[PDB]
C-alpha cells in the first residue's frame, strides 16, 4: 500500500492520472520521481524545468556538478541524483528527441531504466517538446516497465486522449 490517490489502473503495474508531477511529488514525497531529462541535464522547460524550479534551482546546481564530473548521459540512459524537497531520489531519464533525429527505438531503452526501482512517480517520456507520439510512448511504457509506475500527465486533453485510445 502507498499514498498515491486517484489513479486509473492501466495494467498490473502501470497507473495514470491527469496531474502535475510536481504537485504529485510535493503531496506524496515518493522514493523516486522521474525527470524527463536531456543528456546535458539542462532543466529548461517541461517536466525538467518545473521540477527544477520547485527545487529553487538546487536540482540544476547538483546536475551541473554531475556533468562536470561524468560528462553527458546517453540518449536512453539515466542517472540517480537527489530528489531534493520533492522525493528521496530523482531518476533523470533521457528519452529520444524525435526533433533532433534521435531513434524512437531508444524510448524502450529509456523506460528500461525504470525497472531498477520498485516504485516510481513518472512523466510520459518523450512527450511534449521531444515530439514522440504519446500513445506510442504509453504503449512502450506498459510493454517495458515491470515495476510499479505512477504516471502523472498534466495536460488534461492528452490524458483524456490516452485513456480512450489505449490498446
Ligand atoms: O503534460 C504532459 C504532456 C506534455 C508533456 C510536457 C509537460 N508534461 C508534464 N507532465 C506532468 N507534469 C508536468 N508538470 C509540468 C509539466 C508536466 C507533459
From Swiss-Prot:
It is a multi-pass membrane protein. Inhibited in vitro by GRL-0617. It is found in: Host endoplasmic reticulum membrane. It catalyses: Thiol-dependent hydrolysis of ester, thioester, amide, peptide and isopeptide bonds formed by the C-terminal Gly of ubiquitin (a 76-residue protein attached to proteins as an intracellular targeting signal). Residues 1-167 form the Macro domain. Responsible for the cleavages located at the N-terminus of the replicase polyprotein. Participates together with nsp4 in the assembly of virally-induced cytoplasmic double-membrane vesicles necessary for viral replication. Antagonizes innate immune induction of type I interferon by blocking the phosphorylation, dimerization and subsequent nuclear translocation of host IRF3. Also prevents host NF-kappa-B signaling. In addition, PL-PRO possesses a deubiquitinating/deISGylating activity and processes both 'Lys-48'- and 'Lys-63'-linked polyubiquitin chains from cellular substrates. May form homohexamers. Interacts with N protein. This is Papain-like protease nsp3. It comes from Severe acute respiratory syndrome coronavirus 2.
Amino acid at each position: 500500500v502507498n499514498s498515491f490517490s486517484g489513479y486509473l489502473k492501466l495494467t498490473d503495474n502501470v497507473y495514470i492520472k491527469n496531474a502535475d508531477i510536481v504537485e504529485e511529488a510535493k503531496k506524496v514525497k515518493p522514493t523516486v520521481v522521474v525527470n524527463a531529462a536531456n543528456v546535458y541535464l539542462k532543466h529548461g522547460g517541461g517536466v525538467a524545468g518545473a521540477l527544477n524550479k520547485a527545487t529553487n534551482n538546487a536540482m540544476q546546481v547538483e546536475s551541473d556538478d554531475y556533468i562536470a564530473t561524468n560528462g553527458p548521459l546517453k540518449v536512453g540512459g539515466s542517472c540517480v541524483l537527489s530528489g531534493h524537497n520533492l522525493a528521496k531520489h530523482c531518476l533523470h531519464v533521457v528519452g529520444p528527441n524525435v526533433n533532433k533525429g534521435e531513434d524512437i527505438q531508444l524510448l524502450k531503452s529509456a523506460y528500461e531504466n525504470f525497472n531498477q526501482h520498485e516504485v516510481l512517480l513518472a512523466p510520459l517520456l518523450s512527450a511534449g517538446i521531444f515530439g514522440a507520439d504519446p500513445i506510442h510512448s504509453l504503449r512502450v511504457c506498459v510493454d517495458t516497465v515491470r515495476t510499479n509506475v505512477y504516471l502523472a500527465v498534466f495536460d488534461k486533453n492528452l490524458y483524456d486522449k490516452l485513456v480512450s485510445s489505449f490498446l
